[PDB]
């Protein structure tokens, strides 16, 4: 068994501590808007797409979740009038998710607070050099994990 | 509003993607042992404490969660005979979470596999320089988040 060295262990535990604490903190900061981070991430992905809409299978890939889990989540967001589903007449490759105007306005309301939170708890705490170096180091990890 | 620059946004999204994918993968690798990552984190904290026990209030602080959330998790682990709650005779009254013999054996069985997983999905994918850098860059973010 190759136990972690002191240097490896420290890096691993710092990563894990930041991951856990940051996820909690960002969720906490969205709570007053009645949104989960999962909700917010869908709003962002849709708003950055042409026509504010995406094929469900492409949205599933972008949010790294199963067809069935995304479907449940979209039903929840539909019930909150944030998104709607649309049929495709021309093929059988599935439904589109589309942002509603209420979804758009919700995004526009929350985004400034979310960006301020991301900055105060993370981005503004990193030197530009460390940000770049972190990104170059972590990109291949994302790639490995996406493949896995 | 100071919107994220392109460089900041790319880095931020890579951090999010890695945090999410890595948590999912490590949870998946623990599944054959019947353990969640929350379970495992408590096993680790207890096994690294003197006497393989910790005061519940210290354990809440160490895992950065509320008294009520920890309590629900400990109940689950107690039902699984991994930990016991005990008002241990002590000079300072207080409730302890105590690793059971089954907890300790479970830890000894699972730890080698978990370390192999942490290596294959993360640690063995990082150059020594990026490991040092991760640690130096992220420590102040962990500090900030703990202070919240
Ligand atoms: O999953 C881990 O390896 C770990 C390490 C330190 C503290 C809590 C944890 O879950
Ligand atoms: Cl558009
Ligand atoms: Cl000990
Ligand atoms: Na758009
Ligand atoms: Na110990």
């Amino acid at each position: 068994t190759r136990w972690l060295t002191d240097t490896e262990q420290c890096a691993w535990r710092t990563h894990l501590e930041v991951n856990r604490l940051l996820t909690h903190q960002l969720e906490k900061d969205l709570q007053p808007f009645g949104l989960t981070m999962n909700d917010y991430e869908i709003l962002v992905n849709l708003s950055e797409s042409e026509g504010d809409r995406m094929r469900m299978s492409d949205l599933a890939t972008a949010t790294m979740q199963s067809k069935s889990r995304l479907s449940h989540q979209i039903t929840r967001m539909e019930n909150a009038n944030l998104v709607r589903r649309e049929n495709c007449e021309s093929d059988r490759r599935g439904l589109f998710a589309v942002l509603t105007e209420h979804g758009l306005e919700t995004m526009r309301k929350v985004a400034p607070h979310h960006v301020a939170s991301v900055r105060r708890h993370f981005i503004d705490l990193l030197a530009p050099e460390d940000l770049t170096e972190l990104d170059k180091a972590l990109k291949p990890i994302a790639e490995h994990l996406r493949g896995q």
Side-chain angles (χ1 to χ4, degrees), chain A residues 1-27 29-30 32-68 70-91 94-148:
Chain A
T1 302
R2 284 169 335 97
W3 300 108
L4 301 186
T5 61
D6 286 352
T7 295
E8 287 165 338
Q9 187 175 285
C10 190
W12 173 240
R13 292 190 180 192
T14 299
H15 194 270
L16 195 61
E17 187 182 9
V18 171
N19 183 356
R20 280 150 175 180
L21 288 175
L22 189 51
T23 301
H24 185 97
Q25 183 71 50
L26 295 169
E27 187 81 9
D29 292 354
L30 289 170
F33 308 99
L35 288 181
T36 58
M37 195 62 166
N38 286 354
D39 292 335
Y40 186 78
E41 152 179 352
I42 285 173
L43 297 183
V44 176
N45 279 264
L46 296 172
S47 66
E48 295 180 355
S49 309
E50 173 64 38
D52 295 353
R53 70 190 70 206
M54 285 182 62
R55 187 85 78 159
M56 289 292 281
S57 50
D58 292 330
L59 184 56
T61 300
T63 60
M64 314 138 280
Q65 62 188 306
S66 68
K67 194 192 179 169
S68 318
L70 178 58
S71 189
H72 203 256
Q73 178 168 28
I74 291 301
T75 296
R76 160 194 160 83
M77 293 183 84
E78 251 201 303
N79 292 339
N81 194 35
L82 297 167
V83 299
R84 64 173 31 242
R85 289 174 167 113
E86 298 181 319
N87 299 315
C88 177
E89 80 200 54
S90 60
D91 69 50
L95 305 172
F96 296 85
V98 195
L99 271 185
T100 63
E101 185 67 21
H102 177 62
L104 267 168
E105 311 234 29
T106 296
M107 260 253 88
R108 290 192 218 116
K109 184 184 46 158
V110 173
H113 302 287
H114 180 71
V115 176
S117 167
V118 170
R119 281 197 180 281
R120 99 171 65 93
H121 303 304
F122 193 83
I123 291 288
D124 283 2
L125 301 181
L126 290 164
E129 182 182 81
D130 287 333
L131 195 64
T132 292
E133 269 169 35
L134 281 178
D135 193 28
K136 287 179 183 152
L138 292 179
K139 239 152 198 74
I141 295 170
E143 267 163 49
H144 164 80
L145 292 165
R146 283 197 303 276
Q148 188 72 221

